């Protein structure tokens, strides 16, 4: 599974899930925000057996979540 941060506002898992789904299989794709505080930054846990993408997508320091430059690491 991989890790991600920069969870913009309103952005919902369906965003990361479909985002990395095109990057790999992605059977799981979650995002963690803040209780009654979906405004600050957070971190989501995705998972695509495709290690290949994990290889690069992990080094990326500014991915693109629909309209933001979140980040993605390996786990």
From Swiss-Prot:
What subcellular locations does the record give?
Cytoplasm; Nucleus
Q: In which tissues is it expressed?
A: Expressed in neural stem and progenitor cells (at protein level). Detected in olfactory bulb, brain stem, small intestine, and at low levels in brain cortex, hippocampus and ovary. Detected in neural progenitor cells, including neural stem cells.
What are the residue boundaries of the RRM domain, all occurrences included? 1-75
Domain note: The first RNA recognition motif binds more strongly to RNA compared to the second one.
Described function: RNA binding protein that regulates the expression of target mRNAs at the translation level. Regulates expression of the NOTCH1 antagonist NUMB. Binds RNA containing the sequence 5'-GUUAGUUAGUUAGUU-3' and other sequences containing the pattern 5'-[GA]U(1-3)AGU-3'. May play a role in the proliferation and maintenance of stem cells in the central nervous system.
Q: Which family does it belong to?
A: Belongs to the Musashi family.
Spell out the protein name for this chain. RNA-binding protein Musashi homolog 1
Q: Which residues of the full protein are shown?
A: 110 to 184 of 362
